[PDB]
Structure formats: structure tokens, C-alpha cells
Amino acid sequence: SMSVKKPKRDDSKDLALCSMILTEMETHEDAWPFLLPVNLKLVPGYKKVIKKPMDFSTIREKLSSGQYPNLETFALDVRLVFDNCETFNEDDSDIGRAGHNMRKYFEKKWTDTFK
């Protein structure tokens, strides 16, 4: 509250560390569905169904231009990529499996880096 603060957690390396994680996600062999924005002209249903599209290139550009206020807003966008993928893709499809695998990969790196 006013004039009452928990001790200052060191957040000075968060930007660098989120960039490292994102690099690891970009280079994963199962990243291919997620590297670029889904082409809304060429994929029926996507525009209407997925209210907030997100992809790794969009996250990288937001990261690089100071559009994440803190590491939680970064994790929210990463999780949105995988939540969108589960909304649109069957679990037993190459893309559906890719998104489960990547979500797992991310959540471990997130815990190991920050928790």
C-alpha cells in the first residue's frame, strides 16, 4: 500500500532472459507453425474464430520495441500462441502436437529461469 512495499525483486535482466527463451522457442524444430502470423486471407475460419492472433515473430518485434511492460505480459502472449493453436487444431494433427510440445518446452524454461 502507500509507503509500504515488499522488497525489490531484481528485474534488470528480464528483457535479456525473455529474449533468450524466445530464441530457444524460435530454433525448436517444432516451431514452424508459429514462426509467422497465420495468413488471414488464405486460411478459412481463422480471422473469425481467433480473436487475438499471436506468433513468435510478432512477439519478437514487441519485445524488441518495448511493448512488454513486464515479464508476465510476455508470458501471456507466448501462452496465447498455444491457446490459439489448441482452439483451431485437433490434438492428433501435426500442428496440434507441435503446440503441445512447444507449450511444454516453454513452461519448463519459464520455471527454470524465473521460479
Swiss-Prot record:
Subcellular location: Nucleus
Domain Bromo: 9-113
Taxonomic superkingdom: Eukaryota
Tissue expression: Expressed at varying levels in several tissues, whereas a smaller transcript was expressed specifically in testis.
Summary of subunit composition and partner proteins: Component of the BRF-1 ISWI chromatin remodeling complex, at least composed of SMARCA1 and BAZ2B, which regulates the spacing of histone octamers on the DNA template to facilitate access to DNA. Within the BRF-1 ISWI chromatin remodeling complex interacts with SMARCA1; the interaction is direct. Component of the BRF-5 ISWI chromatin remodeling complex, at least composed of SMARCA5/SNF2H and BAZ2B, which regulates the spacing of histone octamers on the DNA template to facilitate access to DNA.
Family: Belongs to the WAL family.
Known role: Regulatory subunit of the ATP-dependent BRF-1 and BRF-5 ISWI chromatin remodeling complexes, which form ordered nucleosome arrays on chromatin and facilitate access to DNA during DNA-templated processes such as DNA replication, transcription, and repair. Both complexes regulate the spacing of nucleosomes along the chromatin and have the ability to slide mononucleosomes to the center of a DNA template. The BRF-1 ISWI chromatin remodeling complex has a lower ATP hydrolysis rate than the BRF-5 ISWI chromatin remodeling complex.
Protein name per Swiss-Prot or TrEMBL: Bromodomain adjacent to zinc finger domain protein 2B
